[PDB]
Amino acid sequence: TVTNEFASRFRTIVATLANVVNERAVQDDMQKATRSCTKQWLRHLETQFD
């Protein structure tokens, strides 16, 4: 019942990674316009592959 372990795993994978993409991005001082649009995109398949 409820969620998975597989989709649930991908969920934390997208994040740990995403968190990683975040450091690199704030690192190469980038507009928040795209840090977000793209993080937003990364986010769609967390749920999307759920």
21: tokens are 């993409």
12-48 burial code (b ≥16 CB/10 A, e <16): eebeeeeeeeeeebeeeeeeeeeeeeebeeeeeebee
Closest contact distance (angstroms) between CB of 16 and another protein is 15
Residue 50 binding another protein, by CB under 8 A: yes
Using CB under 8 A as the binding rule, the residues of this chain from 4 to 33 that contact another protein are 11
Q: Which is nearer to another protein, 27 or 48 (CB)?
A: 48
Binding site for another protein (CB under 8 A): 2-3, 11, 40, 43-44, 46-47, 50
